Amino acid sequence: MENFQKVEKIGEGTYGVVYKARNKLTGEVVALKKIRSTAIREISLLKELNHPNIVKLLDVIHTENKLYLVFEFLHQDLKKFMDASALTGIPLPLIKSYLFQLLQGLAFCHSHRVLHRDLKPQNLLINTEGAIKLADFGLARVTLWYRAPEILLGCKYYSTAVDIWSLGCIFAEMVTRRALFPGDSEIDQLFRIFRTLGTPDEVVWPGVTSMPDYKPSFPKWARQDFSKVVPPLDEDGRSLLSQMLHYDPNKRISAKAALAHPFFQDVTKPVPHLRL
Numbered sequence: 001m002e003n004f005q006k007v008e009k010i011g012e013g014t015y016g017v018v019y020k021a022r023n024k025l026t027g028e029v030v031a032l033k034k035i036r037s038t039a040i041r042e043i044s045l046l047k048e049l050n051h052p053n054i055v056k057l058l059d060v061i062h063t064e065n066k067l068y069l070v071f072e073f074l075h076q077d078l079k080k081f082m083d084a085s086a087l088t089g090i091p092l093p094l095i096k097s098y099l100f101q102l103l104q105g106l107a108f109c110h111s112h113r114v115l116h117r118d119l120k121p122q123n124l125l126i127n128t129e130g131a132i133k134l135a136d137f138g139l140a141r142v143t144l145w146y147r148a149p150e151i152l153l154g155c156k157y158y159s160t161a162v163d164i165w166s167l168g169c170i171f172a173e174m175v176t177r178r179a180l181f182p183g184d185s186e187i188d189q190l191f192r193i194f195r196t197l198g199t200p201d202e203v204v205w206p207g208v209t210s211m212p213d214y215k216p217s218f219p220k221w222a223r224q225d226f227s228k229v230v231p232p233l234d235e236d237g238r239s240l241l242s243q244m245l246h247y248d249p250n251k252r253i254s255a256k257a258a259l260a261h262p263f264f265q266d267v268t269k270p271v272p273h274l275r276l
């Protein structure tokens with residue numbers, strides 16, 4: 001729009017390009033998302049879901065039959081910071097803090113029946129104060145890596161539990177500095193999950209064999225021990241990770257119960273060292 005001035009492209013998201021821009025009135029620096037009546041109304045509902053761990057939706061501009069979303073701007077995403085930190089890894093107290101703030105954002109959005117659906121490191125925004133915020137939230141109203149097994153098996157009516165799964169994938173990833181389930185198609189994603197966690201069955205996930213894309217021809221893999229999966233994570237963290245990675249979405253821990261997990265007993269808020 002004319003009221004703005006792109007400083008630069010800073011992403012191509014699922015929903016079109018993303019720009020750093022300045023408001024020519026306010027002088028504020030914002031993130032500008034160009035999209036590409038229900039989308040209009042649901043959008044403007046999103047403008048009210050405000051919280052410290054949720055990137056603020058500043059303004060929704062429907063003009064010339066286009067739809068720009070103006071967000072509070074942050075300088076770094078977690079993918080970038082994770083690469084920057086690949087040599088020693090993010091320190092555990094900072095992994096823990098990030099995990100805890102994200103679970104707060106999730107808890108908050110979930111309490112309004114709003115879900116993200118597409119969590120992944122690049123949607124996770126960090127600042128110099130040691131905060132981390134969830135961006136893009138509620139707008140599904142290429143990466144398969146963080147996708148919950150119920151989405152993969154063709155569940156159309158999935159829950160908040162899907163975000164808990166993605167965040168569990170991102171938690172593991174921060175700890176080990178490798179992607180947990182780097183699938184490069186839908187079946188390969190599914191089968192990577194099966195190989196680590198065991199092919200699910202009616203015992204561990206009642207109803208699984210009834211899902212749309214479940215095939216009885218699925219190979220049957222035995223589950224691996226978590227000590228092998230996310231070392232050198234302590235038994236608190238692994239415990240918590242296993243409850244986030246439950247197959248049954250009704251067994252999977254809520255963001256709210258996860259906040260009360262013993263892992264979080266010694267949580268602090270360290271500050272990262274960022275090169276902006």
Ligand SMILES: NS(=O)(=O)c1ccc(Nc2cncc(Cl)n2)cc1
Nearest residue numbers: 010031071073074075076077080135
């Ligand atoms: N430079 S970076 O890769 O860490 C990066 C890339 C894109 C964005 N995008 C952004 C910034 N503020 C708000 C929103 Cl919604 N998106 C940030 C950092």
